[PDB]
Amino acid sequence: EKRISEIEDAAFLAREKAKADAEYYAAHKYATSNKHKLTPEYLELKKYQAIASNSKIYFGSNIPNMFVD
């Protein structure tokens, strides 16, 4: 069983090394792609969506000075 565990560890490094290398490439490509996609207007649109998502609004000149929930 000790020998089998040694073989398991030998096979474990390669699997984790492959994932690290694969993850690095995806992040690297995902980085040079954002150099174009993240213009100020795109960031503004994403800001609109994120701020307005799942939000309640109490707008009006004479907002009351009370609240309970």
């Binding site: 609109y48 701020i51 307005a52 799942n54 939000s55 309640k56 609004i57 109490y58 707008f59 000149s61």
Partner: peptide, 16 residues
């Protein structure tokens, strides 16, 4: 995250 807003008008929501 759940949010609530208070302000004079809608456009002020996105201003920072």
């Amino acid at each position: 995250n759940s949010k609530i807003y208070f302000g004079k008008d809608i456009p002020n929501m996105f201003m920072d």
